[PDB]
Amino acid sequence: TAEQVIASFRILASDKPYILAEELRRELPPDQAQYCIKRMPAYSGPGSVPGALDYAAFSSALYGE
């Protein structure tokens, strides 16, 4: 489900509301990391930093949620 995927991304982001490209590269195989980096939109919500990626927007859109 989208809930499980978002929660898993959040875990790899150390519970931040966004994830960074370097965290995807550390935690995921390279092609999986790049697939996500290419398709995650910029996070602009609370606590955003430059390079913040919106894993929640990506995951919700993927499953039509």
Partner 1 sequence: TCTRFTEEYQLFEELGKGAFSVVRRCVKVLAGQEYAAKIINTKKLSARDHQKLEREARICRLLKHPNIVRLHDSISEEGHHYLIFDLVTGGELFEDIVAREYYSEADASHCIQQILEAVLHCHQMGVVHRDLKPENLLLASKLKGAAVKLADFGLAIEVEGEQQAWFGFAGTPGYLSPEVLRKDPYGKPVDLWACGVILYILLVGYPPFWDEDQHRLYQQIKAGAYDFPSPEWDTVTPEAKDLINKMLTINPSKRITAAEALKHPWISHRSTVASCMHRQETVDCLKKFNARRKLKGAILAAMLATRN
Binding residues (CB under 8 A) for partner 1: these are: 4-5, 7-9, 11-12, 27-32, 35-36, 62
* Residue of 52, 16, 8, 14 whose CA lies nearest to 32: 8
Task: Compute the least distance from the CB of residue 7 to partner 1, in Å.
Answer: 8
Task: Compute the least distance from the CB of residue 43 to partner 1, in Å.
Answer: 17
Do the Cβ atoms of 16 and 53 come closer than 8 Å?
no
Nearer to partner 1, 17 or 27 (CB): 27
Task: Compute the least distance from the CB of residue 10 to partner 1, in Å.
Answer: 8
Helix 55-62 and helix 30-39: axis angle, to 10°?
Answer: 90
